Design a protein around this ligand. Structure first.
Ligand SMILES: O=CCCCC[C@@H]1SC[C@@H]2NC(=O)N[C@@H]21
Ligand SMILES: O=CCCCC[C@@H]1SC[C@@H]2NC(=O)N[C@@H]21
Lengths: 529, 82, 541, 541
């Protein structure tokens, strides 16, 4: 019986209020800035490179993905901003690689395509990291991997950051071998030249497809005679399927996936989906771009969960943290979101909640908007560190799928307790207004303003107020620049910057993909009582 | 640490076990005591506890007299620095 | 019955030969250079810092380890050269942290001690990587972790490379939580100040020991409390206080001084109720039939000259006994069975350029070792810029992958030793760093890079000779070395063992005469974990 | 390496002190009282019954056990005082049954022998409970069960308390069937008459032995046969060894006399193909550094006086060595690691009123022992929980529940020893009878009840003082003791160790000087079963 009437979250914001008008205007500008920058990244190398690419009869990398996935299906692209201003004088749109999750023949798959128009498809250090992140996502969720291979090899000027280390280019083949041993299909489509390590990708794949003339495979670098589809297809045997052109190869790939003999099974209970009771675009006015102002995280929840229905857990205890049960697109989810400074009660409340979700095998969603931990002599005497550690330790051991969304600041140990990047959430997204760093820019400035005020007061040479901002202004600039969402996203610290109006859709797609793998039992360490 | 001189160092003074009335005092303002010499007897929730000398040091002072109510973990005796 | 007489490897080198004399002289100089550099790193921050450290009643970090481990037991230190010239103007001896494997109360444990004399124990980016590598070693081998905590927090000027990412400082606590869930004991001894964010390390530990006066544990330091709440507090009062030991309860044991804390740590390990069990067959140990120092003359420092890897094997295996597998097939690769300190080992070593037959032979051998649960040892000496390097590689690509794929999936303990060059895909096939060998060591004469320095120079000398021949402006021979000399210098500098070891790409640079001892200690530690069954992927026939 | 010197617990008591002299005198009298009462129980039914028993050629029940177990081996008898003054006018020494653990053919076994001299071996309600307790002990520790069957059936006047319920006589056969399915050998030796349900015991056993003429097995006795069918048949013809051995086939072995049957039983156990394996680490045994009889003076018989539980620990653990855990936190509870006869043990003992810190400290300790698979020993001397408005506001109940929940889920072997009071919820937190400790023993000075006798008296002295103050008729001080004296008498009588032991609430009353030996035997028996992994519920943080 599911006919019980229940209360719903959310309230109607005051659209006429000046605060709402200002917050909407600021957030809208950030979203518009985000959109137009992606449009530029969409063009890859440029008109001359794109014209040359098409002149060879090859499809553009994004057109390949459009033809590969099922007609009209959504495509969840990841790390669109990788390499954004990362290198001083080189522009590398998207890192030279396009990764995302789409549906092929009704199966969710991870698609990894080299962008040959960007530096001829050479592998920059960020390119390796982006690919490795995609492989990690595919393995953790048991998603088949499809490699649209068109690459020019490693970027020699930066070889030391590509070749040698464990998380360097070599790890790519290690991941392929491991996934194959776990029956996670590895499919490679050679739609261009692959040289040196590149030739290993088709060789390490379970099934392989090569285009008639464009594709070339050789350990040591005419190219067609040395490699080519005909040599590998008919003589070397490296090729499993032979394709006339890019369209033919993509058609063959869809057939290969259809023969995987895989059917998705759900471990969680399902209920009919319902839209939230409030518009999503109101999040612009509610949240704004000023991190100093505070908002009720429940308002964000009310606009993303099915029917804006939410069962809060321990509502009046540790009120700076909000925990409860909801459903997104029918999936059950336990939501943990910051509503103020973390306290001992908040950490205990979170630790209790995480155990509940793990026991019932309920996916967890974290909404990070942190401002730090409570600071005080009494709090330390009562083991706030001991309480904060309880949550870091429960979150780490949880085996249910975890997704993190940074809707505000992310500073210090508060990041760890709320399932930061270091704690292997299945996905991590950030809003365009977010800031992340070891501590807030102001705190670092003020802390230094104590150390050197002390330095010269204790030493005895006076240190004046103008000497203070010759200390504080460079620090604040550095933390503002390095905490910017684009700085964080240019390197692969998150899986993308998302428009707040798209939060519900992105979460729905992400949780759906994460459910391809069975949920394991959670084993906890010692809870330091 | 093995010498057991450490056992004296672990706590500077003996404290009240719980909040309870002082029923007996066995030490004068200046008295030479050896480890295991009973200093005071305290009843808490009708349960008798006898405080014993932590060290062989002479007693510098006494913080409580008979009939006084001593709060939990409050110093009962002061020992001369050696 | 084990009374059968068998043949033994090795031959007596010609000590009078000029080649042997030159090779010995060159290798000896490299070893002497390695020794004296370690001596300097041994001193940590310096005399002034060391004098200040002792003036506070604290033991020096290396003296702490000496007192912690069993009397006279060997200590296997790791990544001694981390941070060597890594940062432009800052000297960070050993990365500010000392990690290694030693025996405590008869149990092999991983010891991670902050060096407070180096930058006050602040965490540099290399410091985090070194600690994370140590934790990875402990987890893969089920070694209890002992943290001698004396730290000053993260190095703010380089925060972006310490805090945020998955392999950044946050991962340290994640590793502690995971090991605890697996019953791999985590023991923390706070022997000095624990700064903001380091207070978690004592808390996340299964059992914890704190020193009476020196130790301080606080999430927020007295300055942050002063800034946030306008309150002035002494470090001892805020944390590491009798408050932490009793009122807060964060401390499990209370120690008078450094010596007392180390004594308590030994007692804690003795109560782990752990006993080592071996999954492999054991035979009595025997010394090799040839002196180890002869490796100086045999190998030398010139990577262009070639030597027989069997000579290296003959001087490290028990009794110089070796059963070669497929000796006459794919002769550029040597595979066989031997024993080191009684443990069974399958050895794979390069003896020339890799061929299709060599890759197939290696793939067959690796399957044999995995089936019988035999540890694997790799001796990397890849060859570069030879007429053989200039060869059709289409077959090599088709067959090499088979070896990359078998090596990756192997679940037996794997140890890699780079005794020569390590270039290109040959690194991957021979269990490079990316393939999670339990340990990776390099000799002082080794070179590692994407390709040999000469090949990169020659390749560019084709691209721009073409660039100007095809374009039509002539490009002369002097224009060639304005192209080639900078490339060769770069690859020589970045392929140097110290460059590789300064960053944590290997677990240390070892003297060739110490190869047998290091391997014996490493394999012994790796056997603390049970050997799992190996599951392979699809072998592309 | 185990050569480290360590500190030891215990101090030399002041033998000259008046308190020690008084405490020794009082405790000694209790022990002497305990000894002489057991001597009387040793005689069973009495001289006339014993003379009749021997006149039939049968051995006395305790002589049977002496001949069954290995020569000179100790025998751990259980519940010697079952049925002590339990029934108004009937004396049932030991409940009519003798149960204990002894070594047969080098294997620890549970021996259950009917005492035919006591009421002809009839089953009283306590007799069923004692047997069921023995079977529970055997199953939890995988001890083979040997039944020396000589019984007269159920005691009809009290049938309603023997036959019907789940824990009534029917459960005895259920336990036999379950243990057999688990490969816990069930051996029955029919050394006398067994009728009605008794005949099922030999039938339900894996292997069965019957004496030539004494033993008789039949579902319906001769009296029922005559009533039902009007036929006169002797017990031997209806049952007997020959009929079952040769015709019915119920008998697996045929024995001439009691001595022959016991010899056959030893042979049967030797063919079980069982070998004991230990899951725990072992160290050489050492005697405690202090005499055990000093416990008389230290503890005494006055529960109002308090003593340091560490003194008790110092006199039972190997070498008086003890590693205390969280010594200065929640000091009213003592937890630490020690060894008894070489076995590792985690000890939890009361040293005052339970507080929130004490409960948290206990919960942390229990998790440690479960993680390392270390047996747990509880020393109950409780006086209640902290009472106060502030303590309740801080969730003392929440903290106390944390310990009840950890103790319940622990899967390591648990042994409880009540050396003092055991009142209220403090009993549950310290692994009371309801929490399935492998064994539970009590000292002769112990007291157990829902609350202390005084508290119940004082509480009532508030309720009726209120009753008449609020109602308005005055209630005087003499009216107070017409209220208090009957309550105090009742709680003193029902909290007496003999009252608790007469019913099977504990496994026996033991002399304090025998504490170390009893614990050593008990832990040794409990180690016959492999230690399972512990699964905890939700810890209400
Ligand atoms: O922001 C400047 C320094 C003082 C305010 C910082 C607050 S104090 C409460 C919270 N916890 C921290 O560590 N920082 C913020
Ligand atoms: O009822 C009175 C005694 C004789 C009849 C009882 C019958 S005999 C068959 C059946 N089995 C028993 O044990 N009782 C009944």
């Amino acid at each position: 019986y599911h006919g019980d009437s229940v209360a719903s979250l959310g309230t109607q914001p005051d659209l006429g209020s000046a605060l709402y008008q200002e917050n909407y205007k600021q957030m809208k500008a950030l979203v518009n800035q985000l959109h137009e920058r992606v449009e530029h990244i969409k063009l890859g190398g440029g008109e001359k490179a794109r014209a040359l690419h098409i002149s060879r009869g090859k499809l553009l990398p994004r057109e390949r993905i459009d033809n590969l996935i099922d007609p009209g299906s959504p495509f969840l692209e990841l790390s669109q901003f990788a390499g954004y201003q990362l290198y001083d004088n080189e522009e590398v749109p998207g890192g030279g690689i396009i990764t995302g999750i789409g549906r092929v023949s009704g199966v969710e798959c991870m698609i990894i395509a080299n962008d040959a128009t960007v530096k001829g498809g050479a592998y920059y250090p960020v390119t390796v990291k982006k690919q490795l992140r995609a492989q990690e996502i595919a393995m953790q969720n048991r998603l088949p991997c499809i490699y649209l291979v068109d690459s020019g090899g490693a970027y020699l000027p930066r070889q030391a950051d590509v070749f040698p280390d464990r998380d360097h280019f070599g790890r790519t083949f290690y991941n392929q071998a491991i996934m194959s041993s776990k029956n996670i299909a590895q499919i490679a489509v050679v739609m261009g030249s692959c040289t040196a390590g590149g030739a290993y990708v088709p060789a390490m794949a379970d099934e392989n497809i090569i285009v008639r003339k464009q594709g070339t495979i050789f350990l040591a670098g005419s190219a067609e005679d040395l490699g080519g589809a005909d040599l590998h297809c008919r003589k070397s045997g490296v090729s499993d399927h032979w394709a006339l052109d890019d369209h033919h190869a993509l058609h063959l790939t869809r057939k290969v996936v259809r023969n995987l003999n895989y059917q998705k099974k759900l471990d969680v209970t399902i209920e009919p989906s319902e839209e939230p009771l409030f518009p999503a675009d109101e999040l612009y006015g509610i949240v704004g771009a000023n991190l100093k102002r505070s908002f009720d995280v429940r308002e964000v929840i009310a606009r993303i969960v099915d029917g804006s229905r939410f069962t809060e857990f321990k509502a009046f205890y540790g009120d700076t943290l909000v925990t409860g049960f909801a459903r997104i697109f029918g999936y059950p989810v336990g939501i943990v979101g910051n509503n103020g400074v973390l306290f001992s009660e908040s950490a205990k409340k979170g630790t209790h909640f995480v155990q509940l979700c793990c026991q019932r095998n309920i996916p967890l969603l974290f909404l990070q908007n942190i401002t730090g931990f409570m600071v005080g002599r009494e709090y330390e005497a009562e083991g706030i560190a001991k309480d904060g550690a309880k949550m870091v330790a429960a979150v780490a051991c949880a085996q249910v799928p975890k997704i993190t969304l940074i809707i505000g600041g992310s500073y210090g140990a508060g990041n760890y307790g709320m399932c930061g990047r270091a704690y292997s959430p299945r996905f991590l997204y950030i809003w365009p207004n977010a800031r992340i760093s070891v501590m807030g820019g102001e705190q670092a400035a003020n802390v230094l303003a104590t150390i050197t005020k002390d330095q010269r007061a204790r030493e005895g040479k006076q240190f004046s107020s103008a000497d203070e901002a010759a200390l504080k202004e460079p620090i604040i600039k550095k933390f503002e620049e390095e905490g910017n969402p684009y700085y964080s996203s240019a390197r692969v610290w998150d899986d993308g910057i998302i428009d707040p109006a798209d939060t519900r859709l992105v979460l729905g797609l992400s949780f759906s993909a994460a459910l391809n793998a069975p949920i394991e039992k959670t084993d906890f360490g010692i809870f330091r009582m | 640490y093995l010498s057991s001189v450490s056992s004296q160092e672990t706590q500077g003074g003996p404290l009240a076990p719980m909040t309870g009335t002082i029923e007996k005092v066995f030490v004068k303002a200046g008295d030479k005591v050896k480890a295991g010499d009973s200093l005071m007897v305290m009843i808490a929730m009708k349960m008798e506890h006898t405080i014993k000398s932590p060290k062989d040091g002479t007693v510098k002072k006494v913080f409580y007299r008979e009939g006084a109510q001593a709060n939990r973990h409050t110093p009962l005796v002061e020992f001369e620095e050696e």
